Amino acid sequence: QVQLQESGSGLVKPSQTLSLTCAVSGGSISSGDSSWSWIRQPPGKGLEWIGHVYESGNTYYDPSLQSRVTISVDRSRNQFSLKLTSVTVADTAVYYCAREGNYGWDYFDYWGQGTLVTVSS
Amino acid sequence: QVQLQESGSGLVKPSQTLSLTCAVSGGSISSGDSSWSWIRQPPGKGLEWIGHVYESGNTYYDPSLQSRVTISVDRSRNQFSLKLTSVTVADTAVYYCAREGNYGWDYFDYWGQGTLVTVSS
Amino acid sequence: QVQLQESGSGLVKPSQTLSLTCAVSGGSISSGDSSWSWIRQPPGKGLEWIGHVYESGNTYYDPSLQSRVTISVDRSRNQFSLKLTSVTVADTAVYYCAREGNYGWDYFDYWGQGTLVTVSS
Amino acid sequence: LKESYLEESCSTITEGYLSVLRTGWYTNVFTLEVGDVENLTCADGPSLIKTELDLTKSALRELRTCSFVLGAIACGVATAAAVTAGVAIAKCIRLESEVTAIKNCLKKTNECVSTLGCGVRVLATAVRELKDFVSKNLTRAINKNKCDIPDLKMAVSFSQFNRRFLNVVRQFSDNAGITPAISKDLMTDAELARAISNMPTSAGQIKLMLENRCMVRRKGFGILIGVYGSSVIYMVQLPIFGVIDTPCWIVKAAPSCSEKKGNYACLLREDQGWYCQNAGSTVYYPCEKDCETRGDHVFCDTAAGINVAEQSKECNINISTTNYPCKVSCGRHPISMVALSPLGALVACYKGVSCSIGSNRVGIIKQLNKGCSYITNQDADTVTIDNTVYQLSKVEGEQHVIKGRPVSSSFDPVKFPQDQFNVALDQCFES
Amino acid sequence: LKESYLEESCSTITEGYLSVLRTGWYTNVFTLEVGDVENLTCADGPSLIKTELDLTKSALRELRTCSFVLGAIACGVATAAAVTAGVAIAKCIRLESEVTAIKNCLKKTNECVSTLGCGVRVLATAVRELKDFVSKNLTRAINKNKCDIPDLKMAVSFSQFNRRFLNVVRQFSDNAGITPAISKDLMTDAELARAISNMPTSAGQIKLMLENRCMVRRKGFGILIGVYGSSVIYMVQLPIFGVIDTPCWIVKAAPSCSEKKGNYACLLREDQGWYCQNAGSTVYYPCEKDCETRGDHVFCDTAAGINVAEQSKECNINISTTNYPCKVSCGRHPISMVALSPLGALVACYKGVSCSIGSNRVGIIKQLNKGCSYITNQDADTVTIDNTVYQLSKVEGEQHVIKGRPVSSSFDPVKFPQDQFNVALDQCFES
Amino acid sequence: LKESYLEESCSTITEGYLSVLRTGWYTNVFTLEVGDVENLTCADGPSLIKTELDLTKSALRELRTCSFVLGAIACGVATAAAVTAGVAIAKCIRLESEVTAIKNCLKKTNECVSTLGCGVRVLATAVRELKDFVSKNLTRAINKNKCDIPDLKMAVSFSQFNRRFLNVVRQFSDNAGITPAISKDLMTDAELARAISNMPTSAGQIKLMLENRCMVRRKGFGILIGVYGSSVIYMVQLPIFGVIDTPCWIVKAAPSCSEKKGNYACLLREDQGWYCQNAGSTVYYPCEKDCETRGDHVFCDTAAGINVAEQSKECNINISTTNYPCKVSCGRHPISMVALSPLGALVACYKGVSCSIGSNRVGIIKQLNKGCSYITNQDADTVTIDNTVYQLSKVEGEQHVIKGRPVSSSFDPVKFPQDQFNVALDQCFES
C-alpha cells in the first residue's frame, strides 16, 4: 500500500553538496502518518538518524548534524527531500528514507530501498 | 363515562367455536387505559382470566388456556373481541370483558354486564 | 464629571410646604448610580437622612419622617426632587442632595453645594 | 391518552402513543440541469434578461467555489451518523464514472433506479425543466447577443423557471453545501410522494408516510455533490420510517421538595423524555431535538435513541425499592416551578411563593397548598405561581393518581455531597 | 449603566437595566381565504398563469396533508408552555362550530373580537385579498379554461397576491405546521400594530410595544389550524409585555484561580445570567435563549424565569460569609479566558499564558500580571491572551471596584471531590 | 488521514487536518440608498407599482422602528465577543459626524477605506443601484402621482431592484436588527471577493479565503446601524482567517465498560472534540457549533477556543499513568452505542444487546463480541446494535491499533461517588 522509493543523482562528485529525496506511493504525505524521517548507515558503525519533517512543516534535526541539514517536505508532490552540505569521506554510506510509527510520538515502521552513490576511478 | 357492553350470539350450538366481543362507550380503546381484558366464571369454581390485548397489539394469554385463545383488539371500531376454540361442557359459564387498572402494571377496575348463552332442549 | 446642583425657591414663607430639587450634569439619572438621596443638616444636631429614590422608582423614606416626605425622580429631565410638608421651626437647616456609592447596597459618594433658605425680618 | 400522576416522585407518565421511528436513510439523486448558460452574453446595456442571466451565472460560478449526559451523546451521535451517511454516499457519487453512469441511466427517462458501485441502491431524478427552457426558449430568444428583447413574458418565465435553481444555490451557499432541511425547491411534493412510494418498506409504513410526508420533509435534508459541466448534481437523504404503531410514553417531573427543621431536600428525575417499545427492546430518546408529537403518534429517530434495559420501566412503579439504578438530580435549595404535562400540570411552590388556580370564567378558584400538586386539565384552565400565569392543555383523557409517601419526604438525604447533577437515586437518599 | 467589579469572586454585576417582561399570550386568528381555485383548470399547454395556478393548488393540497441545570429546565418549560397554549387554543378553534362562529363574526367586517366557547377572548382578522382577487379578477380572466391569456399584468398580479399565501404554506410545511417565528407574511406591520393596540394591558406597555413591535414579532410565532373548504385558517400567538421599566441586572464571572505549591484551586460562579425585580419578587432567567438586551431595556420571558428568593442578592456582596447557598463550579485545572462584560472585561491567565492590552493607536500598552484582572473599556480597546485578540465594548458608564481577598485564595479547597460541576459554595471551600 | 484506535480508553484520534482559524473581524459598511421614495404617492387605485411602493415604504418605516462545561463557556464567550465587537463598531459608526464622514468618503466613489474616529479602519461600500433607479427611472415614470402606468417592464424592474432591499429589511426586522448569517442580499459574491482581497493578512490566507468564500459567508453576519434620511446603513462583520495549514486532530470516545461479578464500571472521555497547534500553543475548541470540517481542512473560531496546556496531548498516549488531570465521565450503568469515527466506528454493546456487522452485498458478516470494538471502514459498510443500522464512512486512510489493557478493566473504580459527570480520571479509578 505504502512504498517509499528514494530518488536522486547516482553520481555525485566529491566535495559537492549532498542531495536526497523520497516519495510515497499508495498514500499521501500531506496527511500520511507524519514525521517523514531520514536515515544513513555509514560503513564501520551502524545506523544514524539525521532529521525529519512533519506534514505541516515542523523540522527536527540531529544535534550533532543539524548545522548542515535542511529537511523539507512538499505536501503537493507528496515527497520530502534532504539537503546535506559539507560532505566528507565519512559521509559515504547508504541513506534511507522512512515513515514513523506514531506510537508515543515517533517510531519507525516503513523504510525505503536505499539510494547509494558509488565512487569508482 | 366508560361502559363495557358484551355482544355476540346468544345461541351457540354445541361443539362449535366460542366467539365473544366487547365495546367501550364514553371512551376510546386505541388510547383507553389498555389491557382490554377478558374473564369467565364457570359454575362450580370461581372466576378465571383467559387473556388480554393492549392498545397497540401485545397479547398475553393464560398458560393453561393460551393454546386456543386468540384475543384481538380493533382501535378503529373501539372493540376488542375473543375467539375460543374446542368448546366443551366445562366451558359453559358467564364470560366478562373488563378494563385494567394500570397501578403497577395491571388491575381490574371496569367490568361488563356479562353475556350468557343458554342451552335449552 | 458629575455635579449635583440644588435648585428651588430661596424665599419660602413660614408655615408653607417644603420643596426641593436636585440635578446631575455630566451624567444620567435614569441609569446613573441610583439611590438619588437627600439630606438635611439642622443647626444644633448633625446630619439627617430623609429618603431616596431609585432609577426605576423604588422610594425609601425615614421611619420618623416618612409620614410627610414624597421623594420623586424624573428619568427624562434627569432630576430627582423633594416634597416636605408640615414645616416647623426645627426644619430650618441646610438640605443636601447626594448620590450613593453602591458598595454593599448604599453609601454616599457625591454631594451637592447646598440650598439654604434665609428668613430675615 | 392515559396519564398517571405518580405522587411518589412528583412525576407523571403519559402513555397511549403510537410510535413512528426512522430506521434508515433513502438517498435520492437530482441533476438540476442548467444548460449552456455561460456561453451567452448581453451586449446592449441593462435589461431584465441581462439581470436574470447575471444572477444565474453568478449562482453557478459561486456554486463551483463551494465544497453521562445522554441527550448530548444521543443528538451528537445522530448528527454524526446523518452527516457521515450523506457524505459517504456523496463520495460514492462524486466519481466521474459514477456520475456518467447516473446520467446515462437518466438519459432516456426522468427517473431510474441505479445500483451504485459501492453496493447501495439509490433513486435518481432529473430536474430538466430549467435546462429545457434555457436550451429551447432562452437560447433562441437571446440570439446575436441582445438581452433587451421586447418580450417581457420571456423574462418573467425565466424568473419563474430559475426560481428553483436560485433558491437551491442560495440554500447551499448559505449553509456551505449542506442544507439543514428539505426546502420545497430541493424536492417538490410530487417528487417526495414518488420517493416515498419507492421506499423499501411495507404497505403500512408507506401509507403512514404518504399521510405525513411534510413531517418526512421536516426530518430530511440535502447535500451538494458538485458542479459538473453545466449541471448542478445534489442528493436528498430522506428518512425511512420502517416502524409504525408501537407503544410509547413520556415522563415529566418537578422538584419533589420536603421541608424539615427549616431545611429542604429536593429531588428531580433525570430520566425524563420519550420512550418506545420495539419487539422486546425499549429505546430511550433523551435529546430534545428529534422527538416530535403529532396528536397520538410520536415521531422519533432511532439513531438518536439509546437501547435501555427493559427493567428500566420499574422506576415508574417502585423507584424507591427497585434494583434498577434510577437517575435523579438532587439538592437542598427549593425550586418553585410548574411542569406542564400532556393532560395536566405539576405545581411545586414552597416557602416564599404563592400558588392559585383559576379559569377564564372566574379569575381565582382556590389557593393551592405547599408541596407538589397535580392539577387536572378538566379541573381548571390556568394556574399561577406568583404573577406568572400558566395555561393548561385541553387534551382529553383519563387522569389517575398513585398514592404513596414521596421519596423526598420518606428518606433521609445524604449529608455530603447533597447537590448531585445526575446520579443514581441510591446515592442521594437512603445511602 | 453602573458596573461593579467584585474582586472577591472575579465577577462583575452590571445594573441599570429596565425590564420588559412577557406576562401572557395574545391570540390572533387569521382566515387566509384562497377562493375557488381548485375548480379552475388550464387546457392550452404551459403558461405563466398555469404555473401559478399549479403552484397554488399544490400548496393547498399539501397543506391539507399536514397536521439542577436551571437553564435547561427553564427553556424546556418555556417551550412546553408556549406550544401547549398554542395547541390548546388551536384545539378550541378547530371545532366546526367554533370555525363557523368565527367566520360569521368576520363575515361582515375584517376584524372582530370573538369570545370562544372555551371562555377565552381572541382577536380575529380576515386576509381576504387573495380570495377577492381569485374571485373577481382571476376567475373571470381565466374563463372557458384558457390560462394563456395575453395579459401579463394579470399573471404578475397573481404572483404578487399569492406571494403571502405561498410563503405561509412554505413556512408551515417546512416546519410541519408550526413556525418558529412570525414572518412578515403571517402578520404584517399594520396588523401587528392593531393587535398591539387591542392588547389587554395599560397605556405604558402598549406604547413601549408600539415602539418595539419588531421585538414583539421576533418573540412571537404562529400555528396552523387546518384547511376548511378553500380557506387556510391559522393563528398567531403574540407576546404580552405586561411589565415595563423595572430593575434588572446581569452577572458575569471568570475562573478565579490561585496557585500554591504548584497546584491551583479554581472556582466559577454558576449563578450567572439575568435577574429582574417585580414587586418584591426576584426572578431568575437562567437559560440563554430568552433574554435579549436592546440598549438600556432587557427583554425576557416570564415563563422561562425561576422565582428565586430575595436573599439570593447577598451572593453579590458577601458570597463567602452569606447564609444563602451560592452556586459555584469548582476544579483544580486552571482555565485562561477573557469573560467580556457589558462595560469592561475580566482577564484570567495563569502559568503558560501571556496577557497584554492595547488599542488601535499603539498595538501594545502593557503586559498584564498573573491572576484575574479588570480591564476598563475607557482604559483600552482590545486585549490579547496568546495570539487571541478580544475587542472591548464602547458602552459608557461608571466602573467600580470592591476590594476583598478572593475566596479562591483565602480558603482551603475541599480535597475530594474537587471537580464539582454545580454545587453550593460551602461544599467546595471552607468545607 | 491517520486514525489510531487507542484500545486503552475505547477512543480514536484522527490526525492529518490542516487548520483554518479565524483570528479577527473585518468590518464592511454598506449604505443601501433607497431614494426619495416617501415623497411619492399613488392616486388612481390599485396597481403593481402601487403595491411595490407600499411595500417599500412600509419596509422603510418599520425599519425606523427597530433598534467547568468548556463547550458552554466557549460558545457563550464566542457569541459575546462577536456581538460586542459588532455593537461597538456600530456605535462608533452611529455618530452623525461619523456617518457624514463615511458618506463624504463614498460620495465620489463606490468603495473607500475610511479610518474611524475610534481608531479602527473599516472598508465601506455604496449599494446605490436602488437609489439610482428610484431617482432616474421610477421618479420620472410616476409623475403627477399615477402609479397605474401602462409599462409592466417598469413594475417588474422595480420588483427586481427592490428585491435586495426588501430581503434585507425582512432579515433585520425578523431578527430584530441583527441577522445570524450573511444572506446573498447583505453582501453579494463580488463584494465578498473584494472584501476578502482587501483583508489585512497574507497572500496564502487571502488565496485560501478566495477559495472558501462561501465558508466565509457562513461564518459571517451583519448588523443594522439605523435609518438616516432615506438610506439604510448596515455593516457586515466578516471573519479574518489569519492562520492556515496548521496541525489539528479530533478525539472520539465510547463507553469503555467492563463487567465483573455482574456489576459494571464504565468510563467516557469528556475531553472530546477538536484541537489545533499554533506556534507552540495548543488550543481546545470544545463547543459543537464553531468547528466544521471540509475535506482535509478544519475551520474553527479562535474566540471559541480555550488555550490548553501542551502536556494535555499526553492523555492520548498514557491517560492512565500521565500526570495531566485527564477528564472523564464515570458511572456504573452500561450504555450500548456506536460512536462513529472519521475512518471507522467504535462499537460498544454489553449484556442485553446484540451486535453484528455487514455490507450491502451480504446482510450479515459476523456477530461482534461483548465489549468495545473497532470496526474499520475498509472492513465493512454498516453495523447493527439491535434493529439500528449505522453506516460507516468511506474516507480513505490508514487505521492503527494501540494495544493496552483498558483502564476501565485494569483499575478498581471508586465506590462512592461512582457517577461523576466531568471529573479528573484520578478521582474515578485508582483513587
Added chain:
Amino acid sequence: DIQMTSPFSLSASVGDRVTITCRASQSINSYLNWYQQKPGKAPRLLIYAASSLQSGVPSRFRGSGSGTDFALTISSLQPEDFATYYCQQSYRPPSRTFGQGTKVEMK
C-alpha cells in the same frame, strides 16, 4: 390449579368488624386485588395493590399489615355491604387466579 383455605361464609350485624383473608401459594408482594360481587352482578374493584383505595370507595374498606400477615378489614358494615368478596393475584402473568369467594350475610 392452586387451592387456598378460607372461611366459606361469615355473618354479623351492621357496624361489626368484618375481616377477610386471601391466601396465595407462590407470592403476591403487592399485586393483590379485591373485588366485591353482589348476586347477579359483576365484581367491583375496591383495592388495588392490597393497600391502595380505588377512587370513590367508602373509607371503611381498608387493608393494613406488614411482614407475613395480610388481611382485608371492614370496620363499619353497611346494609349495601353484603356480598361475596373475591381476591386476585397479578404476580407473574398469565397466572391470574381469583379466589374461591367469601360471602357475608346477616345473622
Added chain:
Amino acid sequence: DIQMTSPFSLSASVGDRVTITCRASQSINSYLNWYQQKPGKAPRLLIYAASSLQSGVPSRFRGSGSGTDFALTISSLQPEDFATYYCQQSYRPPSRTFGQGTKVEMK
C-alpha cells in the same frame, strides 16, 4: 432619634495620631461610612464599609479593628486635614442617620 456619645472636638499638631470613634445603637456590621466636611463645604466620602478606602484618598485615613472595637485613625495629619468628620449607618434603611459630627482644630 438615636443618641451616641463621642468627643465634641479634639486638637493636636501636624503629624499626630488622630483617632475618631463613631458609636451606634443597633448594629452596623460593615455598612459604616466616613465623611469629612470643611466649613461651608459638602462632606467628602473617604471610607465605605469602614475598611474600604475610596479611590483618590490619602493612605493616612485608615480603619482597623475586629470583634467589638472599631475606630477611625489619622496617622499623618496634614494642614488640609482640619474639619468635622461625621459617620453614617446604612444598616436597615430607611434608617440612615449621620453622626453629630467631630471637629479637629490645631492647638
Added chain:
Amino acid sequence: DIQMTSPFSLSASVGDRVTITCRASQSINSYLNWYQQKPGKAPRLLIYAASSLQSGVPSRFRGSGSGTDFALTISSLQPEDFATYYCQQSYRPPSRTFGQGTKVEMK
C-alpha cells in the same frame, strides 16, 4: 556518541532460545524499538515500545521484564530469522541513536 556493550554475534540451531540485550546510557522507559536487517536490506520494525508487537510479525519475537532488566527473546528460531538486530532509543529527541548491531548466524 554513547557506547553500549553487547555481544558481537551469537550462533545457535533452529528452535533455540535466542535472547538479545540492548543497553542505554541515559534512560529509555518504554520508547525502545527493535529492528531486524538482513544483508543488503533495510531494517524491519518488529517491536515498538519494547513490548508492543507490530502487526504482521510472528509471535516468536517477544519482550518481557520489569524493574531494571529488559531483553528481547526469540523462542522459535526460523530459517529466515538470521540477520543483524539493532535497537533504537526515542527518549528525548533529537537524540535517537541505533545500536551497534547484533548478528545471529547458524553454527
